[PDB]
Amino acid sequence: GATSWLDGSGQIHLRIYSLQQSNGKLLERCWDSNKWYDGALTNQFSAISGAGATSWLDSSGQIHIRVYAIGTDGKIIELCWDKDKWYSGALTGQFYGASTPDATSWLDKNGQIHIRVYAYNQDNVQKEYCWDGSKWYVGAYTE
Amino acid sequence: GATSWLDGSGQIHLRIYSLQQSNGKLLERCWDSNKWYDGALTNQFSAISGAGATSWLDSSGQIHIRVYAIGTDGKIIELCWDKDKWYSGALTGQFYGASTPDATSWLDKNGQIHIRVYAYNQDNVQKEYCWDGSKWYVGAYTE
Amino acid sequence: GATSWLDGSGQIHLRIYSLQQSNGKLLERCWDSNKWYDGALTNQFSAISGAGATSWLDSSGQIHIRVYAIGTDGKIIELCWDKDKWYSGALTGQFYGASTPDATSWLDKNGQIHIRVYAYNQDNVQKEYCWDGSKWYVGAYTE
Amino acid sequence: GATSWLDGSGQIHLRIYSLQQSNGKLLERCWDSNKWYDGALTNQFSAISGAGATSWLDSSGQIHIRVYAIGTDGKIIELCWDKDKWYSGALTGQFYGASTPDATSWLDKNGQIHIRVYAYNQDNVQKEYCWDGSKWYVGAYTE
Ligand SMILES: CO[C@@H]1O[C@@H](C)[C@@H](O)[C@@H](O)[C@@H]1O
Ligand SMILES: CO[C@@H]1O[C@@H](C)[C@@H](O)[C@@H](O)[C@@H]1O
Ligand SMILES: CO[C@@H]1O[C@@H](C)[C@@H](O)[C@@H](O)[C@@H]1O
Ligand SMILES: CO[C@@H]1O[C@@H](C)[C@@H](O)[C@@H](O)[C@@H]1O
Ligand SMILES: CO[C@@H]1O[C@@H](C)[C@@H](O)[C@@H](O)[C@@H]1O
Ligand SMILES: CO[C@@H]1O[C@@H](C)[C@@H](O)[C@@H](O)[C@@H]1O
Ligand SMILES: CO[C@@H]1O[C@@H](C)[C@@H](O)[C@@H](O)[C@@H]1O
Ligand SMILES: CO[C@@H]1O[C@@H](C)[C@@H](O)[C@@H](O)[C@@H]1O
Ligand SMILES: CO[C@@H]1O[C@@H](C)[C@@H](O)[C@@H](O)[C@@H]1O
Ligand SMILES: CO[C@@H]1O[C@@H](C)[C@@H](O)[C@@H](O)[C@@H]1O
Ligand SMILES: CO[C@@H]1O[C@@H](C)[C@@H](O)[C@@H](O)[C@@H]1O
Ligand SMILES: CO[C@@H]1O[C@@H](C)[C@@H](O)[C@@H](O)[C@@H]1O
């Protein structure tokens, strides 16, 4: 997964997520100014796929990140950053996934984030999972 | 791959890219208001991986989309939309890829797009390919 | 998948199974003496993985072949050859598979074939499926 | 990968090779009589794919095993057992691999092993690599 955002000074920030071949844990690599370095997510969570990532800036300029992967039980895991720590989101453990999830997100005029996550399930069907601010639900998407 | 943008009315547009198990060609599924439909990219390009996608809006409100996959020669293919047609971009055929590419992009203050594409290569090295408006180059990223 | 056997004259026979990128159908490539040719299985069956294969010779010198793949519903499919046609075996549709299955087989003193098939399931557990001549059952194998 | 052989008492021996999600090393699971156990190959070798396996019995009743995987440099690795140790075979490092290798083998009338290994290469071509007792060579196999 790759996600990026511009701060108020026009500096690009990159966050690159991958599954480490040597320990089965997600890696986060960060660029904030002039070099690559390790992110806090590194080595916290096991997965069995790569990760899809999306991010957004709130009205205060705080970055929010969401990372989606397949966990060690075959179900989608959601990892969240809002301020100062990674935590497992509400999506975690709800749905079986068979592919590296894709994700996109957008902010509406009220500052409510909307997220869409896409992954194959156990029946080889491409599914869309939707967040509009209350509960995850299965979307209308079909292949 | 999933990408999305908001138009001037606050309507979300979704574009979801996937590799068809039946014919080895990329599918584009589109949402503009109230239903999913097959996009113009569908069946124009063969690949052997999934697709990473990024997009941006120019100052006129025109969407630009870039889609990255592994082609049938084992090399990264770049598919481009700027207005009314899909075409193969400058990145195509330069580098071997061994994983579904990730991509991100941002617009600088001068309206110049910057793109970063990430994929494993034939040597099992995670590589970053960078566009800043002239030529693709290998970036500083490492795991 | 690859399987092979020696006939009574000491001639090698090779059978190589793969999933075609262009049509999502299994291909069988055959070697019996001096050239590769397309086997009868070719283009008959859709799958979403590669295929594992095993084979055995009965006391009359008749080859029997079993090929295992993930079907388009996410479940293991078994394709069988005993004499003159491919058919779907008893294993088909019983279990979810999340990996290209592996298979091995042996003949006991009474000429009864025993088959063992290994694949991850939807819960990311490596499973063994066993045939000893009556019904498929889940074996004692654990990772 | 799965391989099996019958000893002189008619007892089945199973050897199941897999890539461990926890450490990126090959696991060998063994059945000789009444239980599964970890074999000596376990945790010796890193890989980035699953493993294909083949085995044969020599005239003394000694098993020989060959295991094929993609190593951490993107090239096929060959792991060999003839009596009492695993070692890297002559195929290791020669060819790029982009898929879990398949392998089969047969003994000719003189007791010379023949091995055939199949894997995609970096150019998305299915390749056959052949051993007849001197050097590995690219075979006539095509799709
Ligand atoms: C300040 O912390 C750095 O940036 C945050 C936005 C997160 O990506 C975090 O894991 C990383 O270590
Ligand atoms: C407030 O809830 C947290 O953030 C939302 C935007 C979602 O990512 C949800 O799954 C998560 O638990
Ligand atoms: C309102 O419908 C929901 O949101 C739309 C933007 C799409 O993601 C659609 O598939 C989904 O069911
Ligand atoms: C109007 O055309 C639709 O939208 C464009 C932005 C592209 O996604 C195109 O392939 C699609 O058919
Ligand atoms: C103008 O060149 C086109 O657009 C750029 C933004 C890049 O995607 C490039 O590879 C492509 O050929
Ligand atoms: C200027 O350096 C280039 O751009 C940065 C934003 C990073 O993508 C870096 O790896 C790359 O080499
Ligand atoms: C004679 O038929 C050839 O050999 C048989 C053993 C099968 O492999 C069949 O699919 C193939 O066409
Ligand atoms: C006789 O039944 C057929 O052959 C056996 C050896 C098994 O492969 C079984 O699943 C298949 O239906
Ligand atoms: C008797 O046990 C059955 O056969 C053995 C040969 C093993 O395959 C074992 O896991 C299985 O349960
Ligand atoms: C006796 O040793 C056991 O059997 C051999 C045939 C090999 O599979 C070895 O790794 C394993 O530990
Ligand atoms: C004697 O050579 C060893 O055994 C042969 C049968 C091959 O597996 C070869 O690559 C390996 O080095
Ligand atoms: C004699 O030809 C060699 O051996 C045969 C058994 C086949 O493996 C063939 O593709 C290879 O070139």
Q: Give the residues across from C42 on adjacent strands.
A: none
Residue matched to tokens 């599914």: A127
User: What's the one-letter identity of residue D9?
Assistant: S
CA distances from C141 to C2, D38, D50 (A): 23, 11, 17
Nearest to C18 by CA among D102, D67, B24: D102
Record the resolution, in angstroms: 1.5
Q: Does a structural domain hold residue A115?
A: yes
How far, in Å, CA of A89 to CA of D69, rounded? 36
- Classify the phi-psi angles of A44: left when phi > 0, otherwise alpha if psi is within -120 to 50, otherwise beta: alpha
The DSSP string of C30-47 is EESSS-EEE-TTTTS-B-
Nearest to C53 by CA among C110, C93, C14, C108: C14
How far, in Å, CA of D25 to CA of D46, rounded? 4
Query: A130 C-alpha to center of ligand 5: Å?
Result: 32
How far, in Å, CA of D69 to CA of D79, rounded? 9
Nearest to D73 by CA among C46, B111, B98: B98
DSSP state of D96: B
Of the candidates D48, D72, D124, the beta carbon closest to that of B48 is on D124
How far, in Å, CA of B79 to CA of A133, rounded? 33
Q: What are φ and ψ of residue A129, in 5° steps?
A: -110, 135
CA distances from D40 to A54, C128, D18 (A): 43, 21, 13
CA-based angle A39:A43:A47, to the nearest 5? 115
How far, in Å, CA of D30 to CA of D41, rounded? 10
Residue matched to tokens 């690009």: A12
Smallest CA–CA distance from D73 into chain B, residue: B123
Q: What are φ and ψ of residue B16, in 5° steps?
A: -120, 125
How far, in Å, CA of D48 to CA of D100, rounded? 9
Taking every pair of Cα atoms in chain D, the longest distance, rounded to a whole number of angstroms, is: 47
Q: Does a structural domain hold residue C60?
A: yes
Cα atoms found within 13 Å of the Cα of residue C103, Cβ hemisphere only: 30
Taking every pair of Cα atoms in chain A, the longest distance, rounded to a whole number of angstroms, is: 47
How far, in Å, CA of D24 to CA of D47, rounded? 6
Q: Does a structural domain hold residue B87?
A: yes
CA distances from B67 to A101, B78, B90, B138, C133 (A): 16, 6, 12, 18, 51
Taking every pair of Cα atoms in chain C, the longest distance, rounded to a whole number of angstroms, is: 47
CB distance C129 to ligand 8 below 6 Å: no
SS3 C95: coil
How far, in Å, CA of A84 to CA of A77, rounded? 19
How far, in Å, CA of A77 to CA of A97, rounded? 9
SS3 C6: strand
CB distance D138 to ligand 11 below 6 Å: no
Q: Tokens in use for D19? A: 């890539």
Nearest to D64 by CA among D132, D137, D5, D1: D5
Q: Does a structural domain hold residue A129?
A: yes
Q: What are φ and ψ of residue C98, in 5° steps?
A: -120, 10
Q: Tokens in use for A56? A: 């957004």
| E-state strands within A48-124 | 52-57, 63-70, 76-81, 86-88, 102-107, 113-120
Which residues, 6+ apart, have CB-to-CB distance to B38 below 8 Å?
B27, B28, B29, B30
CA distances from D91 to C4, C26, D119 (A): 20, 28, 13
| Residue C114's CATH number | 2.120.10.70
Q: Does a structural domain hold residue A61?
A: yes
Which residues, 6+ apart, have CB-to-CB distance to A4 below 8 Å?
A12, A13, A14, A15, A55, B104, B105, B106, B116
Q: Does a structural domain hold residue A111?
A: yes
- Classify the phi-psi angles of D43: left when phi > 0, otherwise alpha if psi is within -120 to 50, otherwise beta: left
Are the CB atoms for D79 and D71 separated by under 8 Å? Answer: no
**Contact flag D22-A23 (C-beta cutoff 8 Å):** yes
Smallest CA–CA distance from A108 into chain B, residue: B10
Q: Which of D17, D19, D21, D106 to probe the C interface (max C CBs under 10 A)? A: D106
Number of separate domains in chain B: 1
User: Smallest CA–CA separation between D22 and chain A, in Å?
Assistant: 5
Residue matched to tokens 């159908």: C25
Residue matched to tokens 């089965």: A24
Residue matched to tokens 């397309």: C38
**Contact flag D21-A24 (C-beta cutoff 8 Å):** yes
Find how far residue C130's CA is from the centre of its chain.
13
If one counts every other C-beta atom within 10 angstroms of the C-beta of residue B111, the result is: 9
Are the CB atoms for D70 and D47 separated by under 8 Å? Answer: yes
Q: Which atom of ligand 7 is nearest to the CA of C39?
A: 12
Q: Write out the residue range of the structural domain in which residue B15 sits.
A: 2-138
Cα atoms found within 13 Å of the Cα of residue C125, Cβ hemisphere only: 11
Q: Does a structural domain hold residue C143?
A: no
Which residues, 6+ apart, have CB-to-CB distance to B130 below 8 Å?
B114, B115, B116, B117, B136, B137, B138, B139
Contacts by residues B84-92 (CB-CB < 8 Å, ≥ 24 positions apart): B85/B40, B86/B40, B86/B41, B86/B44, B86/B45, B88/B45, B90/B131, B90/B135, B90/B136, B91/B117, B91/B129, B91/B131, B91/B136
Are the CB atoms for D68 and D74 separated by under 8 Å? Answer: no
CA distances from A66 to A15, A27, A74, C128 (A): 11, 14, 19, 36
Are the CB atoms for D79 and D89 separated by under 8 Å? Answer: yes
Are the CB atoms for D110 and D128 separated by under 8 Å? Answer: no
CA-based angle A70:B21:C15, to the nearest 5? 105
How far, in Å, CA of C65 to CA of C45, rounded? 15
Residue matched to tokens 């997009």: B55
Q: Does a structural domain hold residue B117?
A: yes
Q: Which of D118, D123, D132 to probe the C interface (max C CBs under 10 A)? A: D118
Cβ-in-10-Å burial (0-12, 13-18, 19+) of B121 comes to buried
Find how far residue A46's CA is from the centre of its chain.
14
Are the CB atoms for B119 and B127 separated by under 8 Å? Answer: yes
User: What's the one-letter identity of residue A45?
Assistant: F
CA distances from C132 to C5, C55, C116, C135, C136 (A): 21, 15, 9, 7, 8
